[PDB]
Design a protein around this ligand. Sequence first.
Ligand SMILES: Cc1cc2nc3c(=O)[nH]c(=O)nc-3n(C[C@H](O)[C@H](O)[C@H](O)COP(=O)(O)O)c2cc1C
Ligand code: SF4
Lengths: 432, 62, 129
Amino acid sequence: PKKTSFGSLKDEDRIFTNLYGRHDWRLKGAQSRGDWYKTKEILLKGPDWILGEVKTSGLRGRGGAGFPTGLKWSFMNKPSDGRPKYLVVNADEGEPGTCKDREIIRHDPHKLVEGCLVGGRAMGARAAYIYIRGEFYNEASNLQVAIREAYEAGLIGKNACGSGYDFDVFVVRGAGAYICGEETALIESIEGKQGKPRLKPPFPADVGVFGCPTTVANVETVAVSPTICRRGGAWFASFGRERNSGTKLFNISGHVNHPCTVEEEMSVPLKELIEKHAGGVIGGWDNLLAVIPGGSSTPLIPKSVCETVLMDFDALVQAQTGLGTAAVIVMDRSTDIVKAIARLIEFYKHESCGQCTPCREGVDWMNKVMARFVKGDARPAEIDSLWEISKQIEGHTICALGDGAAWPVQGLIRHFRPELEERMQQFALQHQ
Amino acid sequence: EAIVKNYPEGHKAAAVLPVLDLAQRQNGWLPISAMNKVAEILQVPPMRVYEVATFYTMYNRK
Amino acid sequence: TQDTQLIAVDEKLDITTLTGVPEEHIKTRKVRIFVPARNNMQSGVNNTKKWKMEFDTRERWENPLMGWSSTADPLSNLVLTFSTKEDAVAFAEKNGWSFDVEERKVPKPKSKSYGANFSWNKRTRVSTK
Ligand SMILES: Cc1cc2nc3c(=O)[nH]c(=O)nc-3n(C[C@H](O)[C@H](O)[C@H](O)COP(=O)(O)O)c2cc1C
Ligand code: SF4
């Protein structure tokens, strides 16, 4: 009837079966692994049926925010006012701890291409723009080899798959900016400007890239869709809990015996992931200090919280953190957590686009303050100031980079204030 | 030319990043003359190419 | 309306003989009734709300001793404030000052659309942000 322990996903129900590149990644291998199967029928069922199945699966955003996919994709169901419509696949993957998108674009690129076709048909888009980060040169070239095979086989382009739908897939490499993972900053980076995010009340579904209706989607969100439509949608919904449904790619990095990328059933306990797939934290589970669950934006949790937490959006939101990109960065007890969070804040300072005052000035301010916190060169009355500054950045910026910089600070202050004050007191004792 | 035809007519300023990257991959880096050449080729203002050059960290301006 | 022995009076109020102003500074002065323009250096509109009465500026010379700015105009600094144009013109008329009053200039309403900055086929699209 119902599930209560959402783990131990089998190989049969894993979407990304060429995750480690141990099979052919080209068209011939991908076809034998189920790809590009009855795509003509999926397209001919119509956009309404495809979107209905994407809603039935309960799939949410796999690139952070986790907004439901079927509802987001249905903003394009409107009739055309003359302007073109595009699907913009987000392949930037700039979040520290996250390397899951990199693995699809080079070992299952045809999954991404056919997901582009299925989704763009669902949104009624003429072309797909895959914006990959410029650092993924080999992955981008693998993706474009796959796109070339899809074109030469008639699966993309004129009369795509025999459906009569005309669809193009263009790859546009980035040039070294993490802010270009943000959907509107990505849009403006496609348009040849600085990667600065736009103010939202004009939404990408109305005014997107080139000023046309667009939907920006993560690589995994796009790539799972052909298996969602071809396997049932109900089949996808039978994995994980309610709301947060399906399966996810997990990046386990940090103080782990076997850091790895694995596909595990959603709502999996963090313990099962770390022990079964990652081989456990070095020194055992007793040696665990924090774990950052969903990439650098998601605030850390302590070992007590991480002891009995489940890996989905709702369970991790209950734990004052987020699921983010399902990039778990575990830290053993031999870790300077203040140094780690200061390094993350330094990353966010280096990646701020500088457009808006709170991110531009405040993230730099928080980096300056956190650098002192590593040395202890501060008074304990500055911790509350750091909290207030982070809340002043949070909810006051154009994009979510300010929020994702303020959140690691809050997660450090929330669970490791004694360590910060201990460092400050040691510094006061050393420097009289 | 193959890069420029990937974007709709009237929106070829969308090729500044890949054309600049091609300039870097040929020359090795971006002298200001390469920035001016890209601006001339795409008929965008040179300052617009300067912004893209100085914003994206993969561009070697030295 | 009240027992004050209401006496009929003309509707041309003239208090010039009672103000004590010398006769030169009534007939020869020309006051300006206006709403002050917004200082273009700032974008605050709180100084463009009341009506002003200013006199015509006269000669300022240089003091031979110190090089200071001298004046013989008693009304060089006199600036009155009013809530409406009508109040200002009534005050100028009962004081016998010749005036020119200009209509208040307010900003016209403007259609601001952030989404125009990313137009698909219009010149309103911006090349930088
Ligand atoms: C600073 C920042 C970086 C982001 N980077 C990525 C990224 O690399 N890949 C991604 O898929 N989404 C990224 N996102 C999230 C996108 O803005 C967007 O919400 C998402 O791509 C929408 O598709 P989804 O609903 O399928 O996740 C980023 C957001 C922010 C604020
Ligand atoms: S929050 Fe930071 S990255 Fe986002 S628009 Fe503002 S300044 Fe730029």
